[PDB]
């Protein structure tokens, strides 16, 4: 969506509206000053929710209302999405809560032990990436790193 400028933001009943330089209230997907945003039919802005525009499933941020990546549970299953609303294939995505999935070639999240980009990582039964903890896989205990989630050597206190 082509950008616009010179229209102020107004708050009505707890919601952000945007009124054009023309002076008309704005609906639908809009790039305002380099930020991609959405307004429903009443002209209120959407934040922290997913909307469907054209063939795209686009999440908008909870603070700014700006289009960015998320994971949506679609029907029974998780599916990742980018800033432009395209289903992601062979990519990591972090959801709103800071949890991480990796979606394979078919866009379906990987589960269990996986080797990605030469890195060993683990995923729980719901597809979420284990980070900063031990995990018993294939009759062995492995620690996965705090931010990368990569397998590394670690020590724990067993008994004393």
């Amino acid at each position: 969506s082509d950008p616009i400028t010179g229209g102020h933001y107004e708050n009505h009943n707890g919601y952000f509206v945007y009124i054009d330089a023309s002076g008309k209230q704005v609906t639908g997907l809009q790039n305002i000053d380099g930020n991609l945003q959405y307004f429903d039919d009443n002209g209120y802005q959407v934040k922290g929710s997913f909307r469907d525009v054209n063939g795209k499933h686009i999440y908008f941020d909870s603070v700014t209302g700006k289009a960015s990546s998320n994971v949506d549970i679609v029907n029974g299953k998780a599916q990742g999405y980018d800033a432009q609303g395209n289903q992601l294939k062979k990519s990591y995505v972090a959801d709103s809560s800071g949890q991480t999935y990796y979606f394979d070639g078919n866009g379906q999240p990987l589960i269990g032990l996986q080797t990605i980009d030469g890195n060993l990582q683990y995923f729980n039964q719901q597809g979420v990436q284990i980070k900063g903890g031990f995990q018993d896989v294939n009759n062995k205990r492995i620690y996965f790193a705090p931010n990368t989630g990569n397998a590394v050597a670690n020590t724990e206190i067993i008994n004393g």
């Binding site: 679609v74 029907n75 018993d136 294939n138």
Partner: protein, 474 residues
């Protein structure tokens, strides 16, 4: 909202019984097909159904909107519709309308193909997609023996819903030798009753009788199947002792006593040599309290071979551990006073100075087995060379043959280093075959190569072991 409309009486069941519904014990399944009253043949004209005109229940009914929406989306993707996205949030009316346009398209491809097998496969595929109809709702796990097959279900005695399946209150689980009376049911001493496949209820007296029938059939196999009294088995190995009801040991013991007088003499007993696969460390003492009707294994010696010779390129327990000096009081090899108050920790048979004066538990012993130091190494080798990914992975015989070539190459490595295979097998056999108070057992795979054709090629160890064996006689 009301769902009934002009198609309802047509798609309704012809009959409310087993004729018109594919079922199991009366119940229905996700992949049930049924007989509708009428059929929208070719998507044109409704015509009465004939007994063979069966249709999938999921063409017409769904357990919930989520499933309905998934069905619609799935069938759409297979050419039946412009690919669609529906959600459980979609109105019921819209989903039902969309189901009908799919039904129409289905009847058209049935006319076009003159077959319904294509649909059977489409439904089967779709059904496995749904979590309630696949393993995701089964809690697959791999710890313990669940490692083998992914987890177990225990059947229950439920006369109201599933009365054919009732056990008549006879499903006692984990009655291994140490827990034969259930007195350790609340601890880890309860036996792991579940191992593989369909676990037979050997706590049921009717099933116990049947196991004896089978036992009789084996011990008289030649008489029964070839009227050849020389083609009969002489003794038995009891597989998976700790995973069944320990009554089976007594049943087998008493049978041999009755028919062969094994309790009469050593000549009778030793004419029908019988062994147990009894891994629990407290089985030897149980077996001996029950009169040694079958020979216990002696893991204590097999274990020490692992630690001191057979396992690991370097850090190995000393040969000193083979002695078990604690057997004597203060470990005094000069004074040799047996410690009556020993902590029950030690090797089964002391051999420091065995003159045959003290009674000891009869046993068999081994270095390797078909199921010890074989199945894991052979698979580790296949995994290590990218032939399979997991130990539980399915492999083909060609996959096995290729792996075997690496296994053999490692076994016979002139460097002397072994990655999958066991070290010092000759030296191990030398000890196994000279030990007093044991019946030694020899593994085919230490004499011949474990893969390929039976006895196709001897191992490098064959000559030494063969010599040891002949020397044992002399």
């Amino acid at each position: 909202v009301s769902q009934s409309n002009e198609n309802t009486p047509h798609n309704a069941a012809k009959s409310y019984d087993k004729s018109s519904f594919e079922n199991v014990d009366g119940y229905l399944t996700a992949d049930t097909w049924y007989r509708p009253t009428d059929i929208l043949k070719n998507g044109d004209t409704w015509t009465a159904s004939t007994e063979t005109d069966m249709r999938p229940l999921l063409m017409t009914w769904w357990p919930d909107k989520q499933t309905q929406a998934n069905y619609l989306n799935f069938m759409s993707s297979k050419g039946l519709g412009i690919t669609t996205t529906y959600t459980a949030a979609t109105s019921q009316k819209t989903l039902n309308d969309a189901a009908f346009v799919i039904q129409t398209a289905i009847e058209q491809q049935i006319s076009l193909k003159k077959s319904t097998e294509w649909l059977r496969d489409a439904i089967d595929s779709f059904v496995k997609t749904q979590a309630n109809w696949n393993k995701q709702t089964e809690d697959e796990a791999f710890d313990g023996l669940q490692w083998l097959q992914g987890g177990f279900l225990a059947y229950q005695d439920d006369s109201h819903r599933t009365p054919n399946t009732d056990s008549g209150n006879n499903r006692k689980l984990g009655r291994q030798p140490i827990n034969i009376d259930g007195s350790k049911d609340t601890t880890d001493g309860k036996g792991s009753e579940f191992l593989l496949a369909n676990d037979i209820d050997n706590s049921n007296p009717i099933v116990q009788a049947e196991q004896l029938n089978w036992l009789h059939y084996l011990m008289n196999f030649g008489s029964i199947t070839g009227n050849n009294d020389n083609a009969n088995f002489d003794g038995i190995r009891v597989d998976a002792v700790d995973n069944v009801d320990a009554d089976l040991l007594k049943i087998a013991g008493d049978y041999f006593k009755a028919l062969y007088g094994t309790d009469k003499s050593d000549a009778n007993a030793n004419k029908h040599l019988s062994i147990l696969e009894d891994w629990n460390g407290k089985d030897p003492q149980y077996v001996n309290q029950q009169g040694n009707a079958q020979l216990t294994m002696d893991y204590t010696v097999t274990s020490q071979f692992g630690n001191s010779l057979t396992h690991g390129a370097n850090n190995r327990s000393n040969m000193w551990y083979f002695l078990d000096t604690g057997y004597y009081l203060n470990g005094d090899l000069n004074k040799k006073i047996v410690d009556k108050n020993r902590p029950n920790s030690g090797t089964l048979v002391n051999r420091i100075a065995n003159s045959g004066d003290t009674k000891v538990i009869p046993n068999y012993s081994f270095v390797r087995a078909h199921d010890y130091d074989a199945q894991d190494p052979i698979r580790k080798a296949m995994i290590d060379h990218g032939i399979i990914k997991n130990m539980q992975d399915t492999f083909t015989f060609d996959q096995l043959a290729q792996g075997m070539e690496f296994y053999y190459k490692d076994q016979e490595n002139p460097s002397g280093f072994k990655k999958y295979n066991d070290y010092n097998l000759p030296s191990a056999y030398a000890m196994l075959l000279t030990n007093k108070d044991t019946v030694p057992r020899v593994y085919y795979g230490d004499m011949y190569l474990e893969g390929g054709q039976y006895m196709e090629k001897g191992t490098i160890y064959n000559p030494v072991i063969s010599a040891l064996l002949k020397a044992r006689i002399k």
